[PDB]
Design a protein around this ligand. Structure first.
Ligand SMILES: CCCCCCCCCCCCCCCCCC(=O)OC[C@H](COP(=O)([O-])OCC(O)COP(=O)([O-])OC[C@@H](COC(=O)CCCCCCCCCCCCCCCCC)OC(=O)CCCCCCCCCCCCCCCCC)OC(=O)CCCCCCCCCCCCCCCCC
Ligand SMILES: CCCCCCCCCCCCCCCCCC(=O)OC[C@H](COP(=O)([O-])OCC(O)COP(=O)([O-])OC[C@@H](COC(=O)CCCCCCCCCCCCCCCCC)OC(=O)CCCCCCCCCCCCCCCCC)OC(=O)CCCCCCCCCCCCCCCCC
Ligand SMILES: CCCCCCCCCCCCCCCCCC(=O)OC[C@H](COP(=O)([O-])OCC(O)COP(=O)([O-])OC[C@@H](COC(=O)CCCCCCCCCCCCCCCCC)OC(=O)CCCCCCCCCCCCCCCCC)OC(=O)CCCCCCCCCCCCCCCCC
Ligand SMILES: CCCCCCCCCCCCO[C@@H]1O[C@H](CO)[C@@H](O[C@H]2O[C@H](CO)[C@@H](O)[C@H](O)[C@H]2O)[C@H](O)[C@H]1O
Lengths: 133, 226, 90, 44, 108, 140, 207, 140, 112, 207, 140, 52, 60
């Protein structure tokens, strides 16, 4: 059942060993030098077919011919639609995110910064502080 | 009112927690598929190991009735073992869920008697394997305690190493197998103890003169040793 | 901490709430509320601690064990909690 | 001195748990003496 | 009807899935896990900047709970790991400031 | 069924393997200079080893040598009946009992602080949910 | 299905968690309640496991006997031949007798069939074997006769045979009744123990 | 060596476990028999003090908690259960050398004293008699 | 390529694990700690000093000797908050919608 | 000592002795009493066997510790040297300190003796080990001083040491008290069960 | 560890033991007249065996022959699904239960008439003694 | 001969007893696990019909 | 166990319950004069009169 990484293993592994992947981003495409545009702010205008479909499927599960997977899916879509507006309200209101919304920076500054020097993990205190010595 | 709506994102978004779940639920998000861990490696019973035992590769006998189907270690593993973490390595020598040889005692005095005769410890019988994180936490706490006990000790890291090897070999559930791995570090600690005592208390001996054939050949160098 | 004590706590809560009213309840009835919630929490931990420890163990082992397969490890815990609540609050 | 039930090599011999035996032989002996050659045998 | 509990257990499952997929070299699975991690929770979003500036007893409680659930130190360089850690810590901070934690076995 | 066993493996000599024994080897015999050296040392009053003295100065605790028919064959034997000490309280441990199942501090500590913290977190989340339910029930 | 084993501490706790103060009255009471609970659970387990094992064993026996096509004193087999059923019901409930319609050879054959069937059915430990064999031997003695003349001679053996027969039937009936009564008593006791456990779990105290 | 045998050092783990089980069973049987006797006597007397007095009708020390044996000590040239740090080459010993037109010691390996092996390979093992000047067969 | 690690090599595997797409801080793996004896020790010390159980529980505090905190949480604060905002708005960064912030963070942390 | 096994029939009884009539009310009641009796006997056996095993084990431990000449927090050993006893009682109850009468070499020797004794006594799992070792290390630091000057510096460590010490003592006391209470409760319960069995044997019926 | 075993015992020929094989024995080969006889019987229409007929008259119950590729190789197989009978009552026996210990008729009969008679004799003697004691008590 | 081996005719009495013990242990473990599950479910439901 | 074609020959029979593994040893080298040649004295050479010591006492 396994799909081998090296079907020609005594040849492929030595000649062309697979590398360690990179999951932060694709790395095969250009880097955007502009952020994403602010999406249109949402509201409860758009939960129509989610509210009514969840009502339908819940009434049908109350009958029993529906199932539970469907109820979970519908409820989670509806709740996502509500969470959109709740998150929009939080972002627009709470002032700590105003800087983050209008956050801008370029790769040149990212490469010129020097905060990477201070990224070392600290050191756990001594176990004698438990006995206060 | 449905139970657990927001609690199965693994189901809503087809996210497998492991390749076995991926294969089962047919999410097919693991590029390399899945080689199933067979049942003899997922569970089983403790066995005898030495070739100088007559009941070798036979299940260990207990006072209580126990399934005699044994855990089989991986003796012929595949070449590519994509996950070489401790999680996937430990399954080759122990079952993660522990052995299937645990008792359910009908009485408390049976438990007492088994313990009294050395045939039961819950530490050993009702327990899983330890995770790498747990092992590391234990080792680091022990190392801190030893460093506090004495910094100016030469056998320090040797004691830490025997502790580390016991933890890695899962001595809670296979103590005899783990001691077989760790007695070398115990022996090295035993040596370091005397080497320190003889350095603290000055102990030396009259060395004899150099032998006539200390060098095998005249053109050979006689590298000086302390 | 016992079911009887927690039930009596919730009855104290409800009667003092009917005394106060829908407008000043959260102001007047904080201590009784905390006592009731703590007792219900003790009951929940006692009656659903095995399932929580099992979920914790499965989480440590990456849900690789036999008992971690499927969704029972989660559904058992949620069902225990639902049963405890239905037994206490109404 | 940390894992006594898991370190059997550093444990006393079963004759020590028995509470029964010019100069007498010692009552307490370890299994770690097996790691020495001239522990029990003489150096003659 | 049990959103806090449900989302907590889901987050833990997704962390475990991320770790397993990393061990098995599965970018698709681990990015799915990262994407499915409840980023649309207003309470946790509001509590994030509060956690980032808290100090003292509350911070120590939340750190203790986070080291219980996830004691491994993430790589300081991997922002996805850093962000999931921050999210879990913010969730625990929200739960603690609503109903504080009682971590001692001795209690009454 | 172990004594007086049969020949199980064959005995043989491979072709042209050497033997290193001459024809007078049976008349050859060994010899050690140790007996003669001992006699000479005793007669000339040369330095004796300390093994002739039964007391042992090589440790702090008292040892006495036990001789097996000769001063060359001895073992030191300790004389002290050593007192041992335990900085331990009695009756604080019942290892046969499984303690993870009993409810209490001893049980949580035979379990871990991690499990206890997880239990507390579940407790807090459950309390949040039940507080919401109480609020909506009593607003009605 | 089983649960996973419980978690254990990674760092060794030796006695550090032991109590530094003697127990209190409520704690002692709670301990007594715990002991009562474990005794109750032991009793319930004994009942449940005995019931389960016996149910499984007896269903297996029933399926085995149905598989090998057995018939007992309670004739509850549908796969039987009508002739075999008549013969068995004669041996169990009625009177085995040869008809005057038959020829003497066929009478001999009928008696041989009766003897073969009955000897396979009843072993030497069976009490009714000797009376049955005696009655069939008397039939063999009296083949060349009419039923009216045969009755006078074979009645003395048929009486003992019928007696042993009815005794076995009464034994079966009594066994069913007594087993039902015992079973119901045990189940009622288990239910009461369960309710006692329920109230004690409502009263139990700790965390 | 006889002292080691008294302590069960030459035994295997199966033998140790069997001895342990034997003690367990003997003790269990003693206990249950004493209980039957005590209950009978206390039932005919109708007195609990009798049961109490049967608690001291049978305590030297205890059974050992753990055991160590010789087969738990590791052995092997390549076994890493014996390797702590590499031993220097100038401290490792040399294998014997034999090379001539007639015979050598390089076409095979006899092994160590414990871990032995056949010097000849699989194709000529059936014909070992042909590589010998003398051959003394088995007894069977 | 990834060959089996025998049991004798596991102690080195625990503190020098192989490379992954999600590695830990190997330099900090010896610094990860979580004391199961913290509260028992605290209680024992306080009860030996002479306090009551209630006083001990009021004076109890959680362990500071735990695994240290990530310095990224204090150095990359604003970048992380912006990334989390982007994720909350764009559904977890599906089809590469938070690549901007994530790449800025990665560059800041790595520097080639 | 045991009884011989009971006698068995030589001839095989299969079902001949089975009842041909259902049980009666008194017989059913007697059966219920028999079940109660066997449950009572099971409980009594559990109590008695646990008590016996624990008594034997703990007496064996006591004899072993007396054989190897051990001394604990309760100094209850007569074979001790007076010097060893003073040292141990200082480590358990009093304050270890070097006297100004002694020469610095003898002070070093005394501190080494304290450290050796305490390290053999307390293992790394012990909580008081670190405070004790710290206090003795401070004494080593402050050998060339007077007790008055040494107190100010070593008090901060002696406080923690004394705290862990008193904690262990309290643990021992509490353990003794709780074990006594539990033991007495169990014995009282067993006695009551015995009397219940006695009355049920006076009421039991049959032969 | 059973397949592909080694030679465990020696192979040999004792001196002057005979072989009974000539030098053309390898060219010798066997022969049976059975095939030719079958052909001749079939061609001349000689008496056939009854094994050519699948039905079996050699018993009263129906049997049918099953052939393995040839009329010479057959086995009879019975056709009936035989009905079995038991002149036994159900639920009259509990063999797992020890019956010598329970008080009752079933218990005495799982014990013996000899033990019951002995018990009755003891009963009678005890009754005699107790009657004497009653007499002397009530005469006073 | 293969039929005889299915019935355990070539086995020894030790092997027969071991197979018997193996079945016994498997059955016992199944039963005790089912009892634990049943008791847990019937305790959270507070109903005897569940045990039944 | 008795047969030489058993691997556990002259070893005690294994039961589900714990049982003493010391075996009954038949008389393999009996004396010439066996004055009592009745069944009472003969049966002791192959079985123990009081039965074997392998009986259980079941907890349930
Ligand atoms: C093609 C190549 C050409 C190029 C060459 C290239 C080579 C150049 C390099 C040189 C070679 C170096 C190679 C490396 C060497 C390492 C190998 C090695 O040495 O050991 C291997 C080999 C390994 O053996 P081993 O199993 O390991 O045991 C080792 C032992 O330490 C030793 O074994 P051992 O001690 O057991 O064997 C010794 C043996 C033999 O010992 C000796 O022979 C000692 C030497 C005496 C020689 C002089 C006496 C001659 C007498 C002749 C008279 C006969 C009558 C005349 C008849 C005429 C008609 C024919 O003992 C006996 O057999 C019993 C004899 C006891 C009595 C002897 C003493 C009395 C002497 C007087 C006789 C009186 C008898 C009276 C009886 C009593 C009556 C009352 O060693 C030996 O076998 C040693 C013996 C080898 C003998 C070889 C036989 C051939 C000799 C002729 C050689 C060619 C001759 C050339 C022409 C010159 C002659 C005309
Ligand atoms: C990490 C890097 C490492 C790299 C590795 C580096 C290596 C190490 C470093 C190397 C450094 C460089 C060092 C240089 C290399 C070292 C080599 C070395 O050490 O050698 C050791 C190495 C052996 O070491 P080993 O550890 O002892 O090995 C096991 C033993 O060798 C096993 O012994 P065996 O059981 O197999 O028995 C062998 C037997 C073999 O002995 C025999 O072959 C005897 C056969 C004689 C039969 C005929 C005899 C007729 C005479 C009868 C006498 C009167 C009758 C009396 C009756 C008793 C005597 C028969 O015994 C002997 O060998 C005795 C040797 C002493 C006698 C030698 C005789 C020399 C006479 C030459 C005559 C020249 C005539 C020139 C005429 C030219 C033409 C005009 O050498 C060998 O290979 C041994 C064989 C050597 C060949 C000798 C053959 C002599 C035969 C002469 C025939 C004469 C007839 C001529 C006929 C033609 C005229 C008509
Ligand atoms: C001291 C006591 C005095 C008082 C006596 C008291 C006794 C009185 C009673 C009599 C004794 C009865 C005792 C009881 C008997 C039971 C024991 C028994 O029989 O079996 C035991 C014994 C047990 O053997 P076995 O292992 O059980 O196997 C049994 C087999 O069934 C049979 O074994 P096998 O079949 O395997 O052996 C047969 C063997 C021998 O088979 C034969 O020889 C067949 C007979 C032919 C003989 C005529 C040919 C003569 C040719 C001579 C010309 C040579 C060139 C001239 C050179 C001149 C310069 C020398 O086969 C071969 O070796 C291979 C030969 C294949 C070719 C032969 C056919 C071609 C013939 C023409 C040759 C052409 C060759 C061309 C090559 C191809 C080129 C293209 O049986 C045998 O061994 C049979 C052979 C025994 C031969 C003995 C050799 C000595 C013969 C001389 C005897 C004394 C002679 C007296 C003076 C007269 C002659 C001058
Ligand atoms: C009936 C007449 C009897 C006549 C007796 C003749 C007596 C002869 C005795 C000579 C013995 C000399 O013995 C030998 O001498 C040399 C120095 O000279 C010693 O010294 C030599 O070896 C030792 C170390 O091995 C070192 O001192 C040094 O490396 C070397 O000089 C040897 O250790 C000793 O073995």
């Amino acid at each position: 059942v396994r799909n081998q990484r090296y079907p020609a293993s005594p040849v492929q592994e030595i000649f062309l060993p697979e590398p360690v992947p990179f999951v932060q981003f694709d790395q095969t495409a250009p880097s955007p030098n502009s952020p994403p545009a602010p999406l249109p702010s949402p509201s409860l205008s758009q939960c129509e077919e989610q509210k009514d479909r969840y009502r339908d499927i819940s009434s049908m599960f109350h009958r029993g011919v529906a199932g539970a997977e469907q109820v979970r899916e519908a409820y989670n879509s509806m709740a996502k639609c509500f969470r959109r507006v709740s998150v929009a309200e939080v972002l627009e209101s709470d002032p700590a995110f105003r800087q983050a919304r209008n956050f801008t920076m370029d790769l040149k500054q990212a490469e010129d910064d020097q905060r990477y020097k201070q990224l070392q993990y600290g050191r756990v205190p001594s176990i004698l502080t438990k006995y206060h010595l | 009112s449905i139970l657990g709506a927001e609690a199965f994102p693994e189901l809503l978004s087809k996210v497998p927690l492991n390749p076995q779940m991926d294969e089962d639920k047919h999410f097919n998000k693991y590029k390399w598929g899945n080689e199933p861990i067979p049942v003899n490696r997922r569970t089983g019973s403790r066995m005898n190991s030495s070739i100088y035992d007559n009941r070798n590769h036979e299940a260990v006998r207990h006072p209580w009735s126990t399934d005699a189907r044994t855990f089989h270690p991986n003796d012929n593993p595949e070449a590519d073992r994509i996950n070489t973490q401790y999680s996937n390595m430990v399954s080759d020598s122990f079952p993660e869920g522990g052995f299937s040889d645990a008792p359910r005692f009908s009485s408390n005095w049976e438990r007492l008697l088994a313990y009294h005769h050395g045939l039961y410890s819950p530490e050993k019988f009702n327990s899983t394997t330890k995770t790498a994180d747990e092992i590391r936490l234990a080792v680091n706490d022990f190392a801190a305690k030893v460093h506090a006990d004495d910094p100016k000790n030469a056998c320090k890291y040797l004691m830490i190493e025997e502790f580390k090897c016991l933890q890695s070999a899962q001595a809670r559930i296979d103590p005899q197998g783990a001691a077989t791995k760790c007695v070398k570090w115990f022996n090295e600690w035993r040596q370091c103890a005397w080497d320190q005592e003889k350095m603290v208390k000055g102990y030396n001996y009259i060395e004899d003169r150099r032998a006539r054939k200390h060098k095998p050949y005249i053109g050979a160098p006689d590298l000086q040793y302390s | 901490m016992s079911v009887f004590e927690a039930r009596s706590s919730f009855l104290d809560l409800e009667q003092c709430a009917r005394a106060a009213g829908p407008q000043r309840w959260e102001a007047e009835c904080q201590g009784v509320r905390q006592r009731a919630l703590q007792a219900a929490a003790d009951v929940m931990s006692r009656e659903c601690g095995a399932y929580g420890d099992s979920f914790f163990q499965c989480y440590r082992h990456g849900f690789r064990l036999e008992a971690c397969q499927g969704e029972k490890a989660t559904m058992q815990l949620l069902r225990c909690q639902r049963m405890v609540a239905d037994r206490l609050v109404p | 001195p940390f894992m006594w039930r898991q370190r059997a090599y550093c444990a006393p011999v079963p004759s020590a748990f028995a509470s029964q035996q010019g100069v007498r032989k010692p009552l307490l002996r370890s299994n770690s003496e097996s790691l020495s050659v001239f522990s029990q045998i003489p150096d003659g | 009807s049990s959103p806090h509990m449900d989302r907590l257990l889901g987050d833990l499952k997704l962390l475990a899935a991320y770790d397993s997929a990393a061990g098995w070299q599965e970018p698709k699975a681990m990015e799915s896990a990262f994407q499915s991690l409840s980023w649309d929770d207003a309470d946790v979003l509001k509590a994030l900047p509060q956690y980032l500036n808290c100090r003292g007893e509350q911070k120590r409680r939340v750190d203790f709970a986070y080291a219980a659930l996830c004691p491994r130190p993430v790589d300081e360089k991997d922002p996805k790991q850093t962000l999931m850690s921050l999210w879990m810590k913010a969730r625990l901070f929200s739960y603690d400031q609503k109903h504080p934690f009682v971590l001692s076995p001795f209690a009454a | 069924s172990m004594d007086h066993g049969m020949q199980y493996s064959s005995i043989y000599w491979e072709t042209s393997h050497r033997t290193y024994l001459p024809f007078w080897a049976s008349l050859t015999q060994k010899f050690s200079w140790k007996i003669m050296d001992d006699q000479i040392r005793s007669f000339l009053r040369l330095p004796k080893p300390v093994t002739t003295e039964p007391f042992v100065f090589s440790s702090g605790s008292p040892y006495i040598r036990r001789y097996f028919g000769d001063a060359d064959i001895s073992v030191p034997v300790p004389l002290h009946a050593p007192a041992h000490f335990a900085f331990v309280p009695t009756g604080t441990v019942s290892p046969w009992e499984e303690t993870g199942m009993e409810t209490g501090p001893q049980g949580a500590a035979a379990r871990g602080a991690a499990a206890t913290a997880f239990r507390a977190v579940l407790e807090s989340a459950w309390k949040c949910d039940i507080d919401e339910q109480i609020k909506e029930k009593l607003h009605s | 299905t089983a649960l996973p084993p419980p978690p254990s501490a990674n760092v060794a706790v030796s006695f550090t968690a032991a109590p530094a103060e003697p127990l209190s009255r409520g704690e002692v009471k709670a301990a007594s309640l715990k002991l009562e609970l474990q005794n109750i659970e032991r009793e319930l387990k004994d009942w449940w496991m005995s019931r389960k094992i016996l149910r499984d064993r007896n269903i297996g026996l029933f399926n085995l006997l149905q598989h090998h096509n057995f018939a007992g004193l309670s004739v509850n087999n549908a796969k039987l031949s009508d002739s075999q059923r008549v013969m068995w019901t004669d041996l169990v409930q009625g009177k085995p007798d040869v008809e005057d319609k038959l020829s003497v050879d066929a009478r001999e054959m009928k008696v041989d069939m009766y003897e073969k069937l009955f000897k396979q059915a009843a072993d030497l430990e069976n009490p009714c074997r000797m009376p049955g064999v005696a009655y069939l031997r008397c039939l063999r003695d009296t083949l060349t006769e009419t039923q009216s003349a045969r009755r006078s001679s074979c009645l003395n053996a048929f009486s003992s045979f019928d007696a042993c027969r009815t005794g076995l039937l009464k034994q079966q009936s009594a066994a069913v009744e007594n087993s039902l009564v015992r079973q119901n008593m045990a189940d009622v006791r288990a239910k009461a123990l369960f309710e006692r456990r329920a109230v004690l779990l409502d009263l139990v105290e700790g965390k | 060596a006889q002292l080691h045998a008294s302590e069960g050092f030459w035994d295997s783990e199966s033998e140790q476990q069997e001895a342990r089980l034997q003690r367990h069973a003997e003790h269990r049987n003693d206990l249950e028999t004493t209980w039957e006797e005590a209950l009978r006597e206390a039932t005919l007397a109708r007195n609990f003090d009798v049961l109490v007095s049967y608690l001291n009708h049978g305590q030297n020390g205890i059974p050992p908690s753990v055991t160590w044996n010789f087969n738990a000590m590791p052995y092997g040239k390549e076994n890493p259960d014996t390797k702590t740090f590499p031993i220097p080459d100038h401290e490792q010993p040399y294998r014997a050398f034999s090379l001539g037109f007639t015979a050598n010691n390089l076409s095979g390996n006899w092994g160590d004293y414990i871990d032995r092996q056949d010097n000849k390979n699989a194709l000529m093992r059936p014909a070992r008699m042909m590589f010998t000047d003398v051959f003394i067969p088995t007894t069977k | 390529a990834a060959s089996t690690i025998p049991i004798s090599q596991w102690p080195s595997l625990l503190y020098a694990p192989p490379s992954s797409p999600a590695n830990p801080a190997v330099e900090a793996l010896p610094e990860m700690q979580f004391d199961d004896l913290h509260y028992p020790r605290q209680m024992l010390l306080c009860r030996g000093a002479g306090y009551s159980l209630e006083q001990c529980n009021r004076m109890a505090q959680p362990d500071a000797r735990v695994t240290p905190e990530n310095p990224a949480e204090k150095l990359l604060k604003e970048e992380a908050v912006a990334a989390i905002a982007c994720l909350s708005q764009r559904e977890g960064g599906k089809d590469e919608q938070c690549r901007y912030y994530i790449e800025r963070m990665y560059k800041l942390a790595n520097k080639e």
